[PDB]
């Protein structure tokens, strides 16, 4: 059975980016690990040329939290266009050996992976 996402995300669903978008706009995403085990994570967007994410991967200690910076590139914003961009978080419980994360993610069984999706929202100041 594919488990639910073990991490607690703040914000849990909607990532908001406040304009104006003539500059780089950054929004934070906190990943909290409420379990007693290390959790490896990977964070991606559906538009890699417009977003950067730092860090895009790592391991979270039990009970700890990491802040992920999502950077939106400047663009010409039209208020009558909603953002169709999604943000994927993929997590897996860390195996004992994590010195080779490429091998860890590749050996991962399908049900060992946990996934969360966040929607993006563009907004201007009031
Ligand atoms: Cl939310
Ligand atoms: Cl646990
Ligand atoms: Cl880079």
From Swiss-Prot:
It is a single-pass type IV membrane protein. One of its GO terms (cellular component) is endoplasmic reticulum. The keyword Endoplasmic reticulum applies. Keywords: Acetylation, Cell junction, Cell membrane, Coiled coil, Disulfide bond, Endoplasmic reticulum, Host-virus interaction, Membrane, Nucleus, Phosphoprotein, Tight junction, Transmembrane, Transmembrane helix. The record marks 42 as: Involved in binding the phosphorylated serine of the phospho-FFAT motif. GO terms for molecular function: cadherin binding; FFAT motif binding; microtubule binding; protein domain specific binding; protein heterodimerization activity; protein homodimerization activity; protein-membrane adaptor activity. The MSP domain binds the FFAT motif of many proteins. This is Vesicle-associated membrane protein-associated protein A. It comes from Homo sapiens (Human). The gene is VAPA. The chain holds residues 9 to 134 of 249 of the full protein.
